[PDB]
Structure 1
Amino acid sequence: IDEALFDAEEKMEKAVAVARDDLSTIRTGRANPGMFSGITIDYYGAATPITQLASINVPEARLVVIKPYEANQLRAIETAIRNSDLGVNPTNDGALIRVAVPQLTEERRRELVKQAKHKGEEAKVSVRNIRRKAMEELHRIRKEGEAGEDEVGRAEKDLDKTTHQYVTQIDELVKHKEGELLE
């Protein structure tokens, strides 16, 4: 009973954390390092995220400043940022890549709102699957008479509450993202 519930809770929480970082990769007004994570260059044979290859810094609200660890990688990093879906055009002063974040077209906000809702959908499905796995275990325990009927009844109601708890948190994260998109 306990192994199944505690493990389910621990996994749900990881899944919520995973969703939080997933949403943080969405292009938004008020730039963040997350939106750069998806972007990747050919780094000596292996595609590498430029989150790994540079130090992203966000001074002003819609102004990003990026410093490549190995200077000769600037061109490729700046080119990757140019050819990404971020809708930005970088410049450089020989050492630092300067990225100006333009305002999103209302035409592109709904599109990124739909991506934020989809990422939420993914994680909620994953939370539901974790519940189902724990729930099947609870059903097996009752079938085999490995715990009292009321004991499992209690665990079932606890498991449901926990699931709702974490499905809502995901909804909250998406609502908060949808808000950041329409700002």
Structure 2
Amino acid sequence: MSPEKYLNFFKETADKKFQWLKEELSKIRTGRPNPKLFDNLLVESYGDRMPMVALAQIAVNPPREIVIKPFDVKNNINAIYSEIQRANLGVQPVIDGDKIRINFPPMTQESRLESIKQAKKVVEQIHQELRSVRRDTLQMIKKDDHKDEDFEEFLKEEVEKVNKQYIAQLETIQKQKEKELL
């Protein structure tokens, strides 16, 4: 591939990796407003694994609560209401008619510590794997351009700055996770 095509392939792989990383960081305990914290965790509806988007809708009326809207209030709201409680939430939920409104008081300083530690370690694993793929791409590049040094150096900083941009995006998303954690 061309060096720009090398960047494109690396960006595709990094986009998949970022989808993965967002998926894991979502489930990790926070102040818990993440719609995808609940989404990547399947629910036990009548003893069966079910999702939430394909079954219900999510909303946030106040900026400290979450609202779940199912279609059925006699057969479907219970299957999600049972699994909302006794989970990583640690809060007592209530139902207001056709919607479950769950409040999320801030976590204790200790559980928040392990949650942040594990989130940072997950981001570290993603970082190490992304750098490994970057080194693989650089190996293909040294198989590719071995002629003009000034051009090969240009390719080196091209890959480096692409990596820095993706690192910045991942760190910004981590900061978003940390702020909504508050």
Q: TM-score range by the shorter chain?
A: 0.7 to 0.9
* 2:14 paired residue among 12, 26, 44: 12
1:73 aligns with 2:76: yes
**Matched residue of 1:98: which SS?**
strand
Distance 1:160 1:67, change over 3 A: same
CA distance in structure 2 between the aligned counterparts of 1:132 and 1:4, rounded to whole angstroms: 12
The residue number in structure 2 matching 1:123 is 126
1:85-137 Cα shifts (integer Å, max 9, x gaps): 12122222453223121221112211221132123213212321331221121
Conserved? CA contact 2:45–2:79, under 8 Å:
no
Whole-Å Cα distance in 2 between the matches of residues 95 and 179 of structure 1?
30
The alignment status of 1:163 with 2:163, answered yes or no, reads yes
C-alpha distance in structure 2 between counterparts of 1:179 and 1:92, whole Å: 27
Contact 1:40 1:47 (8 Å CA) reproduced: yes
Counterpart in the other structure of 2:33: 31
| Structure 2: unaligned runs, 5 residues or longer | none
Q: TM-score, normalised by structure 2?
A: 0.79
Any idea what SS the aligned residue of 2:49 has?
strand
The residue identity in structure 2 corresponding to 1:164 is K
What is the number of residues matched between the two proteins?
A: 179
1:55-93 deviations in Å (ceiling 9; x for gaps): 112111222221113441221211111132121222224
State the superposition RMSD in angstroms: 2.8
Counterpart of 1:106 in structure 2 is: 109
Distance 1:6 1:30, change over 3 A: closer
- Aligned partners of 1:166 and 1:93: how far apart in 2? 42
Task: Say if 1:12 and 1:127, in contact at 8 Å, map to a contact too.
Answer: yes
What residue identity is the alignment partner of 1:166? Y
Q: Which residue of 2 aligns with 1:151?
A: 151
> Relative to structure 1, is the Cα distance of residues 95 and 124 closer, same or farther in structure 2, using a 3 angstrom cutoff?
same
Kindly indicate whether the alpha-carbon contact (under 8 Å) linking 1:127 and 1:166 is maintained by their aligned counterparts in 2: no
Q: Is the 8 A contact 1:116 1:177 kept in 2?
A: no
For 1:156, the aligned partner's letter is K
What residue number does 1:60 align with? 62
Query: Which secondary structure does the structure 1 equivalent of 2:31 belong to?
Result: coil
> Aligned partners of 2:96 and 2:18: how far apart in 1?
40
TM-score when normalising by structure 1: 0.78
